[PDB]
Design a protein around this ligand. Sequence first.
Ligand SMILES: [Mg+2]
Ligand SMILES: [Mg+2]
Ligand SMILES: [Mg+2]
Ligand SMILES: [Mg+2]
Ligand SMILES: [Mg+2]
Ligand SMILES: [Mg+2]
Ligand SMILES: [Mg+2]
Ligand SMILES: [Mg+2]
Ligand SMILES: [Mg+2]
Ligand SMILES: [Zn+2]
Lengths: 68, 103, 204
Amino acid sequence: GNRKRPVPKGATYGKPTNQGVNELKYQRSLRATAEERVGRRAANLRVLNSYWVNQDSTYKYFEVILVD
Amino acid sequence: VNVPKTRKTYCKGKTCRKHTQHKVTQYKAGKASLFAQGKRRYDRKQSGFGGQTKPVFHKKAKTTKKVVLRLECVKCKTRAQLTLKRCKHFELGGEKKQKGQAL
Amino acid sequence: VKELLKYSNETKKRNFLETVELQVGLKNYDPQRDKRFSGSLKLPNCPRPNMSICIFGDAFDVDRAKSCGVDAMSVDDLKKLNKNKKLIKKLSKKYNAFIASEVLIKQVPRLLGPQLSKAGKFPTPVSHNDDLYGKVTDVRSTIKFQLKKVLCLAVAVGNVEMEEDVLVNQILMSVNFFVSLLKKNWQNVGSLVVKSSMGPAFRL
RNA sequence: UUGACAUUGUGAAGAGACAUAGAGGGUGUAGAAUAAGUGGGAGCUUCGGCGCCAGUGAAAUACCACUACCUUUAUAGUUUC
RNA sequence: GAAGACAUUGUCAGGUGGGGAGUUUGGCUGGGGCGGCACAUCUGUUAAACGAUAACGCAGAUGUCCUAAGGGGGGCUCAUG
RNA sequence: GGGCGUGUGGCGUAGUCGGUAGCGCGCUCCCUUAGCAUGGGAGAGGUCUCCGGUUCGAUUCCGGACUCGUCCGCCA
Ligand SMILES: [Mg+2]
Ligand SMILES: [Mg+2]
Ligand SMILES: [Mg+2]
Ligand SMILES: [Mg+2]
Ligand SMILES: [Mg+2]
Ligand SMILES: [Mg+2]
Ligand SMILES: [Mg+2]
Ligand SMILES: [Mg+2]
Ligand SMILES: [Mg+2]
Ligand SMILES: [Zn+2]
C-alpha cells in the first residue's frame, strides 16, 4: 500500500498543496524495502539481487540473494 | 425586442457575394468539450492536493446577455453572426405592431 | 438488398385456391415520438397496376370532361352547397384541378372524417393533367400518421409475380432517408410475410 | 461511513429482470355488438352466421399482415439479488 | 472452542468532517463606523462670454427601450383660443 | 447549467381527453323550530398562470415563456 504521512492527527502546518496525508506514495519499491531490511539483518553479507515470489492483500514476498 | 425570422442581407459565400435570403435563429453556445487543451490543462492542474487552482467569478453585475443572431443563407447554407444591443426580452416570432387599434 | 429473388420467387402462383384479387399489405415497425413532422410521407414511383374500385373526383368542367373521364373516373362541378356530407368513404386517391382553390365553404363540413383536407399533404390543385393517372392510381400511403407509425402498402397483386418486384423493391424501400433522421434503423424493413388472405408464412 | 476491485476457495435452493414462443382483454358516443389501432374490399365460409353497398358512430364490424399496451401464465438461454 | 470465504487488510470512489490546517474578510470619507456613491457615466448650473477647472456643491438622469420608435418616399400640420 | 415537480372562485383545494370543473369556508335567499341558535337546501362565484400544437374533442397529452420548491453541478 501507500505511505501514510507520519504526522500527528493529519496536521501538516503549511500550504494546501502539502496537506495530503493518505494518497502519498513512497518513491522506492517494496522490493527495495525488502532488500534494505535483509541487508540490515545480515550486515556481514552483500545483497546481490532479489525477486518476487508471492503476494496477498497485506504482504508482498521477496527472496533476496546475498553473497558472503 | 422583436426580430423577424427571415432577413435579406449580404452573404460572403464566394458564390453569392450579394444580398440573399437568410433564416434567423438565436445562437446558443454549445457544450464545453473535454480534450480541449484548456480543459485538459485545467484538469491536470486540479488533480491532486492543493484545492481550487483557478479563480471562480462571484461579483456578477450584468442582468442581461447580448443576443446573437445566426443567419443561414438559403442558397449556399453559409452562416453569419451579428450581435444586438442588450435586451431583457427577446422574441423571434413576428407579431407585428398595430397602430390605430384599441388597448 | 432485402432479397434478390429468394423466398418469394414463385410462392404466389402455386397457391391458387382463390383467383380473386389478392392485395397484401407490408407492415413493419419503426417507433417514433409524439411529433407530427416526418412520418407518413414518401409518394414512391411504381409500375405495377392496381385495378382498384376507387373514385377520382376531378373538378374541371370544360369540354375535355370526357378526356378526364377516359384518363380518370369522376367529374365534379362547383355546385357544392348540399352536394356531399356523408358520401365519400371509398377512396384510395383523389385529384382536383384549377377551380378547387377557394372551396373552403365545402372543405370544413365533410373533409374531416377521412381527413382529406387540402393541406400540404394533399396537393390536388395540379396543373400537369396527363401523367398521374395510370401509374399513380396504384396504392401508396400519403396520409397523416398516428402516434407511433403508419406503414402499410400493397407491393403487388396476387396475379402479378416478382418479375416487377425485382425492380420496384430497391427503388421503393428507400423510404424515409430523404426527410427523416436516422433515429430509424438502416432499411428497417425486415421480417415480412406475404399473405393477402391465403399466402404461406416465410421468415428471414 | 458507503460502494467497487483484490485478499477469495468449494456447493445448494428460491426470487426477479431481459430476450425467446404462446395466451386473452379493453367505456361514455352507437351503427348491428363494453369499440384499443392498422392498409384493402365482399367474400373464404358447417350456418347465409359475420360484414359489402344499408344506417350511424371520432373509427367500420368476416379476415391480420403487424400487434399498438398488459401480466394473469407457461419452457429454455444471459444476468441480478 | 467460536467464526468463516463474511469480517479483516490494501487501493480507488461518493458522503460526512471548525476536531484540525491554511487564508481572506474593498475604497472615498471635514477621524473612523453607520449612512451615501461624489468609484464607470449623461444634461443644466456652479464656471469668472475660447478651452480647462474642485467640494459628501445645486437640480436631475444611466446599466434600459424599439422590426419600428431603424431606412427611403409621399400627403398633411401641431398646443391652444 | 442539468434533472424532478407546482400553479384552479374572495380564500383553501379535489380533478378520467367527453366539464367553465366537484367541494369546504365567505355572501345572499329560502326551509326546519312556537321562536333564537344549531342544522338542511338553492342561487350567484373560476377565460383552469399564459401562448401554440396534438387529438373527433384537452384543466388533463406535448412544446415554449413566468413564478415557486427539492437535489446535483461550478476555471472566463
Ligand atoms: Mg505503507
Ligand atoms: Mg510544514
Ligand atoms: Mg495524474
Ligand atoms: Mg484528488
Ligand atoms: Mg480555522
Ligand atoms: Mg478607509
Ligand atoms: Mg468656458
Ligand atoms: Mg425617429
Ligand atoms: Mg415629408
Ligand atoms: Zn449565400
